[PDB]
UniProtKB/Swiss-Prot annotation:
Pfam families: Defensin_4. The record marks N8, P18 as: Important in ability to inhibit Kv11.1/KCNH2/ERG1. InterPro entries: BDS_K_chnl_tox, Myo_ane_neurotoxin_sf. GO terms for molecular function: ion channel inhibitor activity; potassium channel regulator activity; sodium channel regulator activity; toxin activity. The record marks R24 as: Probably important in ability to inhibit ASIC3. The lineage of its organism: Eukaryota, Metazoa, Cnidaria, Anthozoa, Hexacorallia. It comes from Anthopleura elegantissima. Transmembrane segments: none annotated. This toxin potently blocks acid-sensing ion channel ASIC3 homotrimers and heterotrimers containing ASIC3 (composed with isoforms of ASIC1 and ASIC2). It also weakly inhibits potassium channels, and sodium channels. On homomeric ASIC3, this protein shows IC(50)=57-87 nM on rat, 37.3 nM on mouse and 175 nM on human channels. The blockade is rapid and reversible. On heterotrimeric forms, the toxin is less potent (IC(50)=117 nM on rat ASIC2b-ASIC3 channel, 900 nM on rat ASIC1b-ASIC3, and 2 uM on rat ASIC1a-ASIC3). Changing R24 to A/Q: About 25-fold decrease in ability to inhibit rASIC3. The keyword Transcription does not apply. This is Pi-actitoxin-Ael2b.
Length: 42
């Protein structure tokens, strides 16, 4: 995955993934150009 930002933080860029995984511990996510950015960056 690539490194993305939701404004003032870093997150993980998921290719075509509007729904973050449950196995991880993400709180918020910002829609990306192609995919989405799940934060925090784990």
């Amino acid at each position: 995955g690539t490194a993305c930002s939701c404004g003032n933080s870093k997150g993980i860029y998921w290719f075509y993934r509007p729904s973050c995984p449950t196995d991880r511990g993400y709180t918020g996510s910002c829609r990306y150009f192609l995919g989405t950015c799940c934060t925090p960056a784990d």
